[PDB]
Homo-oligomer: A and B are copies of this chain.
Amino acid sequence: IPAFHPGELNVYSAPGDVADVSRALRLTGRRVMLVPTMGALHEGHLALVRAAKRVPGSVVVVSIFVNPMQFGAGGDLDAYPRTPDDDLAQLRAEGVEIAFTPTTAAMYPDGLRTTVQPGPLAAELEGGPRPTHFAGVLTVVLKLLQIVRPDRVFFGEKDYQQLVLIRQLVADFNLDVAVVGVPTVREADGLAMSSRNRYLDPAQRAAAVALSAALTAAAHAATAGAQAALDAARAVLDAAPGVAVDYLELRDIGLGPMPLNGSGRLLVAARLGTTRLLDNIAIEIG
């Protein structure tokens, strides 16, 4: 067991160190909670941390690892925001006891060898133009789950397709962990918090409110049916200056091979300049 200081933030980079500490804690009765992140922490991540912290007898592990495998090109990987010092400052302020910060070499000593092949959902929506993105996400999450062996793992609803794919991973591989989805944290005007929001200039920040406005308009319009909901959302997006919609789709909640029937999810992706923003909302039809 590496040194562990209860009540303080303990940072471990070696997978073996966090694995040993987690096992030891689990053996003494504490329930290990895992919050996987790629760093650049904001209030949305803190909500995941808080959800984890409130589980009785919990010890929280926040992993910070910008996973190369889920980036389609080195350019995107190099562009990903990195603010390590602020991240750890936020974790200490939150009372987090463990941050797991592995190196790329420790996670991929053999490059891409055995990997996770997601189901068909990975080739749609976000996966359409980025066919290997979700295999990258599921492979790293599977590894993080095996290293930490948490009782529960927390993900934000903002990246809803990712959340669904992780539930598929857990069910399909018989993983003994509970997946907890946490509601999206939003700015005062409705904008979904995201590390990519820092790339919106003042005008784009103003126009970006259209995504959340379109989704909530659609959710209330839905009493009149799917067409009314989608058209309300389209009208709001169309009134927004400089917002180029990638997709706007209403799907069954599992996003799978099932038609929309009562409870659904409305998902949107749009570009403001070079920044691609995502958002989604629960929708009840009729």
Instruction: Give the B-binding residues of A (Cβ under 8 A).
Output: 15, 19, 109-110, 112-120, 135, 138, 142-143, 146-147, 149, 165, 168-169, 171-176
Contact of A117 among B15, B135, B173 (CB under 8 A): B135
* Copies of the protein in its oligomer: 2
The answer on a CB contact under 8 Å between A146 and B118 is no
Other than the given A113-B168, A117-B117, 10 more pairs (CB < 8 A) read: A110-B172, A113-B172, A114-B118, A114-B119, A114-B138, A114-B168, A114-B169, A146-B174, A146-B175, A146-B176
Q: CA A117 – CA B120 in complex, angstroms?
A: 14
Residue of B nearest to A177 (CB): B146
Q: CA A176 – CA B119 in complex, angstroms?
A: 25
The answer on a CB contact under 8 Å between B19 and A110 is no
The answer on a CB contact under 8 Å between A171 and B138 is no
Residue of B nearest to A143 (CB): B174
Residue of B nearest to A23 (CB): B176
Contact of A172 among B114, B147, B175 (CB under 8 A): B114
Residue of B nearest to A120 (CB): B113
The answer on a CB contact under 8 Å between B115 and A117 is yes
The answer on a CB contact under 8 Å between B110 and A171 is yes
